C-alpha cells in the first residue's frame, strides 16, 4: 500500500521435517482449509520421491528449488503509444514463491491419477532440471532477456 510495507506472517517448523520449506509447500497446496489433507499429499509425494531416489526428500527439494530458481521477471509498463516489457531483478523470497507456485500449478494439471504421485514426479523432474517448472523458468528467462534494451 501507500503507507509503507506490511510485515509477512511467520511460519512454524514441521516436527517431521524441521524446515520452513515443507510448511511453505503445504501452505501453497492448501485449498478449502484442509491443512491436514495438504500435509498428507505432500508427505505421500515426499515418501514416493524418497522411495524412488534414496536421498533425503528435503535435499531433493532443495536441489529442485535451486534448479528452478529464476533470476529476472518481465513486468510490463506502458508509456506512450505502445506497451513493452521491462526486465527487472527478483528478490530471493519472491523468486522462491514464484517457483513454488509454478511447480504446484504444473503438478495440478499433469496426466496422472492422484496428487501424491503427481507431486512426487513434479519434484523429481524439478530436481533433475527437466520438468514443466524448469521449462517455464527457461521461457521466462529468455523472453525477459529478449527485452534487455528497455531496462529503465
Partner RNA sequence: GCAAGGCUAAAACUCAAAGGAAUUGACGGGGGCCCGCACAAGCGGCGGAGCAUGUGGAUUAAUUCGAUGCAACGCGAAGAACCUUACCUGGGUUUGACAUGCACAGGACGCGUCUAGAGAUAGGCGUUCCCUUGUGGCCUGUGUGCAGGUGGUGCAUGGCUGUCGUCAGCUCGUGUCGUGAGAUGUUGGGUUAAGUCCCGCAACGAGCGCAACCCUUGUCUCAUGUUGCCAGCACGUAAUGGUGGGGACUCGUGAGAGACUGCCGGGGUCAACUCGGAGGAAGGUGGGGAUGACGUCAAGUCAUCAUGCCCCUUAUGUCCAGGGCUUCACACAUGCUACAAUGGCCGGUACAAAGGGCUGCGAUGCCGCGAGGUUAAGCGAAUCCUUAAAAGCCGGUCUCAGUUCGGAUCGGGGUCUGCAACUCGACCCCGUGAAGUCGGAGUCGCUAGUAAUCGCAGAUCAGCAACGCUGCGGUGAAUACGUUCC
27 binds RNA (CB under 7 A): yes
Distance CA 70, CA 134 (A): 9
Q: Which residue in the set 19, 24, 53, 128 belongs to the binding site for RNA (CB under 7 A)?
A: 24
Counting residues that bind RNA (by CB under 7 A) gives 37
Distance CA 109, CA 125 (A): 15
Binding region for RNA (CB under 7 A) out of 35-43, 58-66, 135-143, 144-152: 35-43
Rg (CA), the chain: 17
Distance CA 124, CA 126 (A): 5
Least separation in angstroms between residue 109's CB and RNA is 9
Q: Is 10 helix (H, G, I), strand (E, B) or coil?
A: coil
Q: Which residues from 52-71 bind RNA, rule CB under 7 A?
A: none
Q: Which residue in the set 55, 77, 130, 138 belongs to the binding site for RNA (CB under 7 A)?
A: 77
Distance CA 19, CA 143 (A): 34
Bridge partners (DSSP) of residue 77 are 84
Binding site for RNA (CB under 7 A): 1-6, 8-9, 11, 24, 27-38, 40-41, 75, 77-78, 91, 93-94, 97, 101, 105, 108, 113-115
Amino acid at each position: 500500500p501507500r503507507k509503507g510495507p506490511a510485515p509477512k506472517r511467520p511460519l512454524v517448523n514441521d516436527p517431521v521435517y524441521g524446515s520452513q520449506l515443507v510448511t511453505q509447500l503445504v501452505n501453497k497446496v492448501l485449498l478449502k482449509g484442509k491443512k491436514s489433507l495438504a500435509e498428507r499429499i505432500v508427505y505421500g509425494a515426499l515418501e514416493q520421491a524418497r522411495d524412488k531416489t534414496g536421498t533425503d526428500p528435503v535435499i531433493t527439494l532443495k536441489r529442485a528449488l535451486d534448479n528452478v530458481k529464476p533470476a529476472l521477471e518481465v513486468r510490463s509498463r506502458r508509456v506512450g503509444g505502445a506497451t513493452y516489457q521491462v526486465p527487472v531483478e527478483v528478490r530471493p523470497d519472491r523468486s522462491t514463491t514464484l517457483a513454488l507456485r509454478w511447480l504446484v500449478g504444473y503438478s495440478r494439471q499433469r496426466r496422472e491419477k492422484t496428487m501424491i504421485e503427481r507431486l512426487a514426479n513434479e519434484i523429481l523432474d524439478a530436481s533433475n532440471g527437466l520438468g514443466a517448472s524448469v521449462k517455464r523458468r527457461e521461457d521466462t528467462h529468455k523472453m525477459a532477456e529478449a527485452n534487455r534494451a528497455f531496462a529503465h
